[PDB]
Amino acid sequence: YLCPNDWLLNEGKCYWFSTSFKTWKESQRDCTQLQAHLLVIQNLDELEFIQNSLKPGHFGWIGLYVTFQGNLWMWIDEHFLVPELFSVIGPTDDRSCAVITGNWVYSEDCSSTFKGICQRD
Amino acid sequence: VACSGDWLGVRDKCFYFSDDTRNWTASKIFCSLQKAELAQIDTQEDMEFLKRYAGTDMHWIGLSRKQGDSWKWTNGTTFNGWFEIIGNGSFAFLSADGVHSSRGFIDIKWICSKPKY
Ligand SMILES: *[C@@H]1O[C@H](CO)[C@@H](O[C@@H]2O[C@H](CO)[C@@H](O[C@H]3O[C@H](CO)[C@@H](O)[C@H](O)[C@@H]3O)[C@H](O)[C@H]2NC(C)=O)[C@H](O)[C@H]1NC(C)=O
Ligand SMILES: *[C@@H]1O[C@H](CO)[C@@H](O[C@@H]2O[C@H](CO)[C@@H](O[C@H]3O[C@H](CO)[C@@H](O)[C@H](O)[C@@H]3O)[C@H](O)[C@H]2NC(C)=O)[C@H](O)[C@H]1NC(C)=O
C-alpha cells in the first residue's frame, strides 16, 4: 500500500497537503485531478493524525461545508457531521466551508484561497 | 539601541516571530503587552525579510478591514496598497508565498513590529 513522493499514510488512506492556495471548490477539484478528494475525516483516529501532522502556521480545507438550506455542516461523502467528532469555531452560515488547524476546526469564507488537504485509498 | 534576545532587529524596526498559535485579536493584544502592533510592514525591504523568515509558516500582520469598511493597520491609518491582499477576508496573514485574508478565528502564528526607538 502506497502513494507517490510527498504523500503521508495513515491506514488505507493517502494524504497530499497541496502547496498552493485555492478557493475551496478549486481544491476539491485539484484533488479530483489526482483521483482523490478533499479531506473527509472518517473518525477520531483519522482526526488525531492530520491534527498533530500540522505544524503551527499550517492548515487547510476539508470535505466539510455549510449547506445553504438547512444551513448545516456536511461532508462531501454525503453524511451529516456530528458533535461526536468535533465542532467548527465560527459563524455557520451558507457560503462557509471548513479548514483545519493543528488544534481545532474553524469556519471560513469558501470564496477564499487556502492550501488544500486531499485523500483517497 | 537594538532589540532584546527574542526580537529580531531589521533597520528601524524590531520584529517578533511567534512560536505557538493564536487568533488575530489574541495577537493584536500580545504585541500591545509589549507596546507594539501586529508587524505592520511599510518598506519594500521589510517585505522580503518577512516572507523569507516565515516561509511555509503562516503569521498575522495587523492589517484588517472592519466589515466591508476598509483595510486598516493596528496603529492609525488607512492602508494604501503597494501590495495585493488576496483572500477576501478581514484579517491578513503572511506566508513566504504571499499574504491572504481570513476571518481571524484560525489559530496560527503572528509577527510583531514596533519602532526600534
Ligand atoms: C481570540 O481568543 C480569545 C481568547 O483566547 C477569544 O475570547 C476572549 O475570551 C472571552 C471569553 O472566554 C471574551 O469575553 C467576552 O465574552 C464573555 C462570554 O460571553 C462575556 O461574558 C464577557 O463579558 C466578554 O465580553 C473576550 O471578549 C474574548 N476576547 C475578545 C475578542 O474580546 C477572542 O474572542 C478571540 N477573538 C476572536 C478573533 O474571535
Ligand atoms: C501608522 O503606521 C504606518 C506604518 O508604520 C505609518 O506610515 C509609514 O511611516 C514610515 C515612517 O517614516 C514611512 O517610512 C519612510 O521613512 C523611512 C524612515 O527613514 C524611510 O525608510 C523611507 O523614507 C520611508 O518612505 C512609510 O513610508 C509609511 N508607510 C506608508 C507607505 O504609509 C503611518 O504614518 C502611521 N500612522 C500614524 C501617524 O499613526
Side-chain angles (χ1 to χ4, degrees), chain B residues 22-27 29 91 103-105:
Chain B
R22 288 197 188 182
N23 62 37
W24 188 94
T25 324
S27 309
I29 310 171
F91 304 96
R103 290 180 175 174
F105 276 170

PDB file of all heavy atoms in Angstrom, chain B residues 22-27 29 91 103-105, ligand 1:
ATOM      1  N   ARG B  22      -2.326  31.590  17.787  1.00  0.00           N
ATOM      2  CA  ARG B  22      -3.382  32.389  18.396  1.00  0.00           C
ATOM      3  C   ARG B  22      -4.288  32.970  17.317  1.00  0.00           C
ATOM      4  O   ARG B  22      -3.970  32.883  16.129  1.00  0.00           O
ATOM      5  CB  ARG B  22      -2.798  33.558  19.205  1.00  0.00           C
ATOM      6  CG  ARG B  22      -2.122  33.198  20.504  1.00  0.00           C
ATOM      7  CD  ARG B  22      -1.990  34.434  21.358  1.00  0.00           C
ATOM      8  NE  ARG B  22      -1.173  34.188  22.542  1.00  0.00           N
ATOM      9  CZ  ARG B  22      -0.918  35.099  23.482  1.00  0.00           C
ATOM     10  NH1 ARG B  22      -1.427  36.328  23.381  1.00  0.00           N
ATOM     11  NH2 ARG B  22      -0.156  34.781  24.529  1.00  0.00           N
ATOM     12  N   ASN B  23      -5.419  33.553  17.722  1.00  0.00           N
ATOM     13  CA  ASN B  23      -6.283  34.173  16.731  1.00  0.00           C
ATOM     14  C   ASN B  23      -5.778  35.592  16.482  1.00  0.00           C
ATOM     15  O   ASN B  23      -4.868  36.069  17.165  1.00  0.00           O
ATOM     16  CB  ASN B  23      -7.750  34.188  17.154  1.00  0.00           C
ATOM     17  CG  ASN B  23      -8.000  34.969  18.396  1.00  0.00           C
ATOM     18  OD1 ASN B  23      -7.409  36.022  18.676  1.00  0.00           O
ATOM     19  ND2 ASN B  23      -8.947  34.467  19.169  1.00  0.00           N
ATOM     20  N   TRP B  24      -6.357  36.263  15.500  1.00  0.00           N
ATOM     21  CA  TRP B  24      -5.894  37.593  15.175  1.00  0.00           C
ATOM     22  C   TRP B  24      -5.947  38.576  16.339  1.00  0.00           C
ATOM     23  O   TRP B  24      -4.981  39.309  16.580  1.00  0.00           O
ATOM     24  CB  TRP B  24      -6.687  38.159  14.012  1.00  0.00           C
ATOM     25  CG  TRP B  24      -6.103  39.439  13.540  1.00  0.00           C
ATOM     26  CD1 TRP B  24      -5.211  39.609  12.525  1.00  0.00           C
ATOM     27  CD2 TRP B  24      -6.333  40.734  14.095  1.00  0.00           C
ATOM     28  NE1 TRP B  24      -4.869  40.932  12.409  1.00  0.00           N
ATOM     29  CE2 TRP B  24      -5.548  41.649  13.359  1.00  0.00           C
ATOM     30  CE3 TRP B  24      -7.128  41.214  15.144  1.00  0.00           C
ATOM     31  CZ2 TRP B  24      -5.532  43.020  13.637  1.00  0.00           C
ATOM     32  CZ3 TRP B  24      -7.112  42.580  15.425  1.00  0.00           C
ATOM     33  CH2 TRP B  24      -6.318  43.468  14.669  1.00  0.00           C
ATOM     34  N   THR B  25      -7.075  38.602  17.048  1.00  0.00           N
ATOM     35  CA  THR B  25      -7.249  39.517  18.177  1.00  0.00           C
ATOM     36  C   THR B  25      -6.354  39.153  19.356  1.00  0.00           C
ATOM     37  O   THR B  25      -5.779  40.030  19.996  1.00  0.00           O
ATOM     38  CB  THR B  25      -8.705  39.542  18.682  1.00  0.00           C
ATOM     39  OG1 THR B  25      -9.614  39.401  17.582  1.00  0.00           O
ATOM     40  CG2 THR B  25      -8.977  40.862  19.377  1.00  0.00           C
ATOM     41  N   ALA B  26      -6.254  37.859  19.643  1.00  0.00           N
ATOM     42  CA  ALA B  26      -5.422  37.368  20.738  1.00  0.00           C
ATOM     43  C   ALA B  26      -3.962  37.779  20.510  1.00  0.00           C
ATOM     44  O   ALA B  26      -3.131  37.771  21.435  1.00  0.00           O
ATOM     45  CB  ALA B  26      -5.527  35.838  20.834  1.00  0.00           C
ATOM     46  N   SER B  27      -3.674  38.146  19.264  1.00  0.00           N
ATOM     47  CA  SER B  27      -2.341  38.559  18.849  1.00  0.00           C
ATOM     48  C   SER B  27      -2.218  40.083  18.896  1.00  0.00           C
ATOM     49  O   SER B  27      -1.210  40.618  19.365  1.00  0.00           O
ATOM     50  CB  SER B  27      -2.074  38.049  17.431  1.00  0.00           C
ATOM     51  OG  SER B  27      -2.361  36.662  17.325  1.00  0.00           O
ATOM     52  N   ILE B  29      -3.494  42.049  20.798  1.00  0.00           N
ATOM     53  CA  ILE B  29      -3.244  42.341  22.200  1.00  0.00           C
ATOM     54  C   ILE B  29      -1.779  42.094  22.551  1.00  0.00           C
ATOM     55  O   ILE B  29      -1.077  43.001  22.995  1.00  0.00           O
ATOM     56  CB  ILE B  29      -4.091  41.439  23.117  1.00  0.00           C
ATOM     57  CG1 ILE B  29      -5.555  41.463  22.682  1.00  0.00           C
ATOM     58  CG2 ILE B  29      -3.984  41.913  24.558  1.00  0.00           C
ATOM     59  CD1 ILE B  29      -6.393  40.437  23.414  1.00  0.00           C
ATOM     60  N   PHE B  91      -8.838  39.784   7.968  1.00  0.00           N
ATOM     61  CA  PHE B  91      -7.572  39.695   8.691  1.00  0.00           C
ATOM     62  C   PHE B  91      -6.531  39.082   7.761  1.00  0.00           C
ATOM     63  O   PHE B  91      -6.758  38.022   7.154  1.00  0.00           O
ATOM     64  CB  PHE B  91      -7.769  38.851   9.941  1.00  0.00           C
ATOM     65  CG  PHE B  91      -8.848  39.376  10.829  1.00  0.00           C
ATOM     66  CD1 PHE B  91     -10.147  38.866  10.746  1.00  0.00           C
ATOM     67  CD2 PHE B  91      -8.588  40.426  11.716  1.00  0.00           C
ATOM     68  CE1 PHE B  91     -11.176  39.391  11.534  1.00  0.00           C
ATOM     69  CE2 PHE B  91      -9.610  40.962  12.516  1.00  0.00           C
ATOM     70  CZ  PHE B  91     -10.904  40.443  12.423  1.00  0.00           C
ATOM     71  N   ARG B 103     -10.870  35.084   8.517  1.00  0.00           N
ATOM     72  CA  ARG B 103     -11.838  35.566   9.478  1.00  0.00           C
ATOM     73  C   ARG B 103     -11.138  35.816  10.801  1.00  0.00           C
ATOM     74  O   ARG B 103     -11.769  36.240  11.760  1.00  0.00           O
ATOM     75  CB  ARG B 103     -12.966  34.551   9.652  1.00  0.00           C
ATOM     76  CG  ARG B 103     -13.863  34.458   8.429  1.00  0.00           C
ATOM     77  CD  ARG B 103     -14.978  33.440   8.597  1.00  0.00           C
ATOM     78  NE  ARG B 103     -15.903  33.455   7.466  1.00  0.00           N
ATOM     79  CZ  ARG B 103     -16.891  32.580   7.312  1.00  0.00           C
ATOM     80  NH1 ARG B 103     -17.066  31.622   8.207  1.00  0.00           N
ATOM     81  NH2 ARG B 103     -17.693  32.653   6.262  1.00  0.00           N
ATOM     82  N   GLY B 104      -9.834  35.549  10.845  1.00  0.00           N
ATOM     83  CA  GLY B 104      -9.051  35.773  12.051  1.00  0.00           C
ATOM     84  C   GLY B 104      -9.372  34.880  13.237  1.00  0.00           C
ATOM     85  O   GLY B 104      -8.925  35.146  14.358  1.00  0.00           O
ATOM     86  N   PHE B 105     -10.145  33.825  12.992  1.00  0.00           N
ATOM     87  CA  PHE B 105     -10.533  32.878  14.038  1.00  0.00           C
ATOM     88  C   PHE B 105      -9.494  31.769  14.202  1.00  0.00           C
ATOM     89  O   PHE B 105      -9.197  31.328  15.319  1.00  0.00           O
ATOM     90  CB  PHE B 105     -11.900  32.270  13.697  1.00  0.00           C
ATOM     91  CG  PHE B 105     -13.070  33.119  14.126  1.00  0.00           C
ATOM     92  CD1 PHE B 105     -14.363  32.808  13.703  1.00  0.00           C
ATOM     93  CD2 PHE B 105     -12.884  34.215  14.976  1.00  0.00           C
ATOM     94  CE1 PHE B 105     -15.453  33.571  14.120  1.00  0.00           C
ATOM     95  CE2 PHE B 105     -13.959  34.979  15.397  1.00  0.00           C
ATOM     96  CZ  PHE B 105     -15.246  34.657  14.968  1.00  0.00           C
TER      97      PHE B 105
HETATM   98  C1  LIG C   1      -9.368  35.238  20.335  1.00  0.00           C
HETATM   99  O1  LIG C   1      -9.113  34.487  21.563  1.00  0.00           O
HETATM  100  C2  LIG C   1      -9.789  34.963  22.751  1.00  0.00           C
HETATM  101  C3  LIG C   1      -9.460  34.005  23.932  1.00  0.00           C
HETATM  102  O2  LIG C   1      -8.144  33.458  23.877  1.00  0.00           O
HETATM  103  C4  LIG C   1     -11.281  34.926  22.445  1.00  0.00           C
HETATM  104  O3  LIG C   1     -12.154  35.047  23.622  1.00  0.00           O
HETATM  105  C5  LIG C   1     -11.956  36.049  24.533  1.00  0.00           C
HETATM  106  O4  LIG C   1     -12.277  35.493  25.857  1.00  0.00           O
HETATM  107  C6  LIG C   1     -13.564  35.873  26.497  1.00  0.00           C
HETATM  108  C7  LIG C   1     -14.450  34.666  26.701  1.00  0.00           C
HETATM  109  O5  LIG C   1     -13.721  33.499  27.034  1.00  0.00           O
HETATM  110  C8  LIG C   1     -14.312  37.001  25.846  1.00  0.00           C
HETATM  111  O6  LIG C   1     -15.134  37.589  26.874  1.00  0.00           O
HETATM  112  C9  LIG C   1     -16.354  38.119  26.470  1.00  0.00           C
HETATM  113  O7  LIG C   1     -17.340  37.063  26.318  1.00  0.00           O
HETATM  114  C10 LIG C   1     -17.851  36.562  27.571  1.00  0.00           C
HETATM  115  C11 LIG C   1     -18.742  35.362  27.275  1.00  0.00           C
HETATM  116  O8  LIG C   1     -19.892  35.746  26.533  1.00  0.00           O
HETATM  117  C12 LIG C   1     -18.598  37.687  28.254  1.00  0.00           C
HETATM  118  O9  LIG C   1     -19.299  37.199  29.385  1.00  0.00           O
HETATM  119  C13 LIG C   1     -17.590  38.759  28.650  1.00  0.00           C
HETATM  120  O10 LIG C   1     -18.266  39.886  29.176  1.00  0.00           O
HETATM  121  C14 LIG C   1     -16.794  39.230  27.440  1.00  0.00           C
HETATM  122  O11 LIG C   1     -17.496  40.266  26.776  1.00  0.00           O
HETATM  123  C15 LIG C   1     -13.357  38.015  25.307  1.00  0.00           C
HETATM  124  O12 LIG C   1     -14.064  39.170  24.888  1.00  0.00           O
HETATM  125  C16 LIG C   1     -12.692  37.371  24.135  1.00  0.00           C
HETATM  126  N1  LIG C   1     -11.777  38.326  23.537  1.00  0.00           N
HETATM  127  C17 LIG C   1     -12.217  39.326  22.763  1.00  0.00           C
HETATM  128  C18 LIG C   1     -12.302  39.068  21.271  1.00  0.00           C
HETATM  129  O13 LIG C   1     -12.510  40.450  23.196  1.00  0.00           O
HETATM  130  C19 LIG C   1     -11.493  36.072  21.476  1.00  0.00           C
HETATM  131  O14 LIG C   1     -12.897  36.305  21.240  1.00  0.00           O
HETATM  132  C20 LIG C   1     -10.839  35.614  20.178  1.00  0.00           C
HETATM  133  N2  LIG C   1     -11.017  36.632  19.162  1.00  0.00           N
HETATM  134  C21 LIG C   1     -11.660  36.366  18.019  1.00  0.00           C
HETATM  135  C22 LIG C   1     -10.900  36.645  16.722  1.00  0.00           C
HETATM  136  O15 LIG C   1     -12.808  35.909  17.968  1.00  0.00           O
END
